[PDB]
């Protein structure tokens, strides 16, 4: 219960930190979009591990 509750909180805090490391800025916007799509799929996958 508590270990899994803590992990999930630690995982979301980590996901938020990843989004915060990709702040919005032609070439820079294309680069920004690629990195957001990547953070999104990682977050989606990490979170799915906690959703069953």
């Amino acid at each position, epitope marked *: 219960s508590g270990d899994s509750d803590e992990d999930l909180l630690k995982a979301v805090r980590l996901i938020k*930190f990843l989004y915060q490391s990709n702040p919005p800025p032609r070439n820079r916007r294309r680069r920004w979009r690629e990195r957001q799509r990547q953070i999104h799929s990682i977050s989606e996958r990490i979170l799915s591990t906690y959703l069953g």
Partner: antibody
Amino acid sequence: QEQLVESGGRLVTPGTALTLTCKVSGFSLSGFWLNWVRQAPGKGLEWVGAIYRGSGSEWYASWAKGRFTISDTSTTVTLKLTSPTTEDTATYFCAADTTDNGYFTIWGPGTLVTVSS
Amino acid sequence: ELVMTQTPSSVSEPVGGTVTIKCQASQSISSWLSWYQQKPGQPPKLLIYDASNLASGVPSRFMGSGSGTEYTLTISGVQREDAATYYCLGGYPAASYRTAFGGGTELEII
């Protein structure tokens, strides 16, 4: 360019707290997973844990929790063995994930820890 | 929590033969699977990443594939230099089930 060097490997009595250091150099990236992997003599690789370098986000194997502490420094990542046993005898490697995708692209040569009574 | 069951434990193949190494994930890991090669006295080397992508500087004879929970490392034309021990790595550090290595496969070349 990218380099990892582990140090601190010694012969220790069981229960003697020990710290290993992973000297991190030539990484363009700011944040990345810096992992700790161990290998007992003649055995397989075992994941100990990792820290995501920009943050203080530590993740441990079920068996590693309480017995190992991963700490982040400016130019280093440390692995402290809080109270080692004979079962902790291994070469300890640090391995960096350069993409955030989960796989290890850069490894250190390893540091040997011997735990004997 | 995540367990990677690696089979076989050992394989003996003559030069030019095909080697098949399997890893079964105890949980759904998707493309969170990589293959490593380790020779004595050396740290492991990345072969395959994201289940099926060939890593930089790895011979084309190394192939990775995955279907659901089953992952395969194929070495099509085995060479003498391919004698080593092989490991898969599944999962992610922040996943509920963490990350884990398979028990390894010792490849010997006849």
